[PDB]
């Protein structure tokens, strides 16, 4: 497990560190949306911060199921429920929670166990997936993950109103890579000397 950068919005040095977590807070109880990200490990995006993603950048073809673990770092007195959905390839981004439940999903309940595991099953037409990118090669897309509020983020008097969530990513025991190649990014601008 390594930290996954779902919140890869900030870019300046004074704020690089909050790309490692994203917040939750009390809402109006209408099934609001929290975050979305794709499920390609070797593609540009959130997965580039993981060891699995960096290593898969060296191989063109992969196959296997992934796993994502979310850790809640609120106060002990805070409760809530969330819906975490995986949309299989071919479908657009869900517009609301009612549409998003129709995919693979898990209901997360805050308690003495801080973490939950969302397993991204291997659902594909081919035995292996080549590395797609922008353009017509996206026919090997993997799908989407979105996190929706289930009930609310309820907190008593005297505890903070905003809490942060840390996400960790890895691969399962059926994961495999193939066709070793050079990595896409070169960490040198001139002569290293």
């Amino acid at each position: 497990e390594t930290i996954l950068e779902v919140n890869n919005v900030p870019t300046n040095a004074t704020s690089l560190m909050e790309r490692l977590r994203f917040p939750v807070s009390a809402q109006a109880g209408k099934g609001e949306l929290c975050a979305v990200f794709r499920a390609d490990p070797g593609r540009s995006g959130p997965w580039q911060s993981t060891l699995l993603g960096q290593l898969c950048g060296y191989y063109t073809q992969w196959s296997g199921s992934l796993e994502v673990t979310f850790m809640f770092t609120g106060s002990f007195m805070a409760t809530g429920k969330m819906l975490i959905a995986y949309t299989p390839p071919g479908g657009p981004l869900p517009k609301d929670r009612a549409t998003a439940m129709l995919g693979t999903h898990v209901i997360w309940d805050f308690g003495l166990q801080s973490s939950v595991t969302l397993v991204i099953p291997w659902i594909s037409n081919t035995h292996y997936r080549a590395h797609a990118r922008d353009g017509v090669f996206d026919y090997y897309t993997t799908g989407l993950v979105s996190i929706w509020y289930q009930t609310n983020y309820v907190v008593p008097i005297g505890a903070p109103n905003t809490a942060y969530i840390i996400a960790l990513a890895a691969a399962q025991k059926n994961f495999t890579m193939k066709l070793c190649k050079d990595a896409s990014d070169i960490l040198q601008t001139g002569t290293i000397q």
């Binding site: 063109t60 292996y128 996206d138 897309t141 066709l179 040198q188």
Partner: protein, 297 residues
């Protein structure tokens, strides 16, 4: 637990393929048996019915009076390896001193074997193929002479950074396979495995790679099979300065370890585009030759 009769006796789940036909060895042609005259009613092998869709099965022994011939003609030369394991031209790369095509001394060639008619017609007799390959690189100047020049070939799998100049950093080839060879040497020859994410290459693909609205700009996606995109082949002249000789490179491919599925009709029109079965609409010609009348030769 199954308790209802329609589930107990159900045939759902049968994963085995019922085969009506089986393969039989045939090293030589079939022999001819002795035959004699026949004068009887009710048994007629001459009359058939082509409507069913089956080839007529009347033989020599049932129609004319024949002798016994011990046929020993081999069938070894018509196998898939014997037909396909022959090298042929599939691509040319030009490296002129001055020009607009490859002015910098480097070139990228996307690997596809539908660029030349001789190979394309042979390979498109089938729909799916699974094979290994053998590539050969013959390099010479436009006048055909051999000169002391050092070249580098690099295989770039999809997803790797494509070189953009002769001094690009991608030429460090820490992971990509590469070949350093001189023009005075014999041609370079390497062996390439089967690289498809699927179980076979398909030369025809009736579909689009992505969802969405299929407008005019998003129309070239028809027939574009992502599983036949096998990367790029990059060439360059080794050196920090410009080369002295203009060079032409021809690539020859030889198949081996071949398996094929689903034969289809052969092409009878001139080719126009790559990965595109379009044909000249206003200039359609017959498959064969013509004659003045049907009653004369």
């Amino acid at each position: 637990g199954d308790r209802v009769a329609d589930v107990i006796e159900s045939s759902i789940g049968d994963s085995v393929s019922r085969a009506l036909t089986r393969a039989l060895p045939a090293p030589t042609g079939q022999d001819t048996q002795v035959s004699s005259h026949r004068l009887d009613t009710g048994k007629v092998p001459a009359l058939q019915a082509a409507e069913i869709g089956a080839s007529s099965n009347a033989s020599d022994e049932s129609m004319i009076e024949t002798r016994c011939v011990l046929n020993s003609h081999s069938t070894a030369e018509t196998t898939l390896d014997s037909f396909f394991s022959r090298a042929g031209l599939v691509g040319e790369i030009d490296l002129p001193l001055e020009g607009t095509t490859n002015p910098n001394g480097y070139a990228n060639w996307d690997i596809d074997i539908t660029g030349y008619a001789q190979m394309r017609r042979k390979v498109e007799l089938f729909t799916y193929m699974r094979f290994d390959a053998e590539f050969t690189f013959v390099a010479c100047t436009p006048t055909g002479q051999v000169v002391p020049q050092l070249l580098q070939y690099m295989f770039v799998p999809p997803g790797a950074p494509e070189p953009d100049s002769r001094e690009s950093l991608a030429w460090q080839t820490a992971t990509n396979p590469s070949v350093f060879v001189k023009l005075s040497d014999p041609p370079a020859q390497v062996s390439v495995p089967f690289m498809s994410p699927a179980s076979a290459y398909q030369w025809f693909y009736d579909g689009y790679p992505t969802f969405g609205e299929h407008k005019q700009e998003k129309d070239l996606e028809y027939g574009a099979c992502p599983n036949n995109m096998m990367g790029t082949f990059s060439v360059r002249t080794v050196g920090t300065s410009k080369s002295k000789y203009p060079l032409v490179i021809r690539i020859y491919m030889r198949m081996k370890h071949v398996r094929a599925w689903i034969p289809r009709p052969m092409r009878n029109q001139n080719y126009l585009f790559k990965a595109n079965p379009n044909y000249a609409g206003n200039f359609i010609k017959p498959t064969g030759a013509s004659r003045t009348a049907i009653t004369t030769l």
